[PDB]
Amino acid sequence: MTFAKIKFSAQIRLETGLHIGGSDAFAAIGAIDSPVIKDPITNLPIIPGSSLKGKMRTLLAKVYNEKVAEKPSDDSDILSRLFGNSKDKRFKMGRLIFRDAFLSNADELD
C-alpha cells in the first residue's frame, strides 16, 4: 500500500581476493598483468553492482525457476519481479537497486 524503501547495508569482506576484471585503461605503464576494475580517481579496487546483480541472478536462476531460462528475459515471476525484465510491462523496473561497492577499511589495511 504505502511507499517505503528498505536499505540492506552490509560489508563485503574478501576471504580470498577478488579479480573483477575490466580492461587496461588504468593499467600502469609497464604492467603486463590482467587488471582489476578500479575507481578512476582513487584507483582503489571496487565491486561494481553489475557483477553482484549478474551473479546473484544467475545463482537464483538455478533455484527459483524450475525451467530452462534460455535468456534473462525468460526468468520467472519471483526473479523478474526483483531484478527486472525487459520483456514484461509489469516488471520493466525491478524493485532491487544495486550500488557499486567501494573500499572502506583502507586505513585498517594500512
Closer to other proteins by Cβ: residue 17 or 40 = 40
Beta bridge partners of 101: 47
Select from 56, 76, 81, 98 the one that contacts other proteins (CB under 8 A).
98
* Side-chain half-sphere exposure of 26, counting CA atoms within 13 A: 13
Handedness of CA 24, 30, 33, 37 (dihedral sign): negative
The one-character DSSP state at 83 is: H
Nearest-approach distance from CB 73 to other proteins, in angstroms: 11
45 binds other proteins (CB under 8 A): no
* Alpha-carbon gap, residue 5 to 12, rounded angstroms: 21
Beta-carbon neighbour count of residue 79 at 10 Å? 21
Shortest distance in whole angstroms from residue 42 CB to other proteins? 8
Residue 66, all three cell numbers? 524450475
**Binding map of other proteins across residues 78-97, x = CB under 8 A, - = no contact:** -----xx----x--xxx-xx
Residues at the interface with other proteins (CB under 8 A): 3, 5, 7, 21-25, 29, 37, 39-41, 48-50, 52-53, 58, 61, 68-72, 83-84, 89, 92-94, 96-100
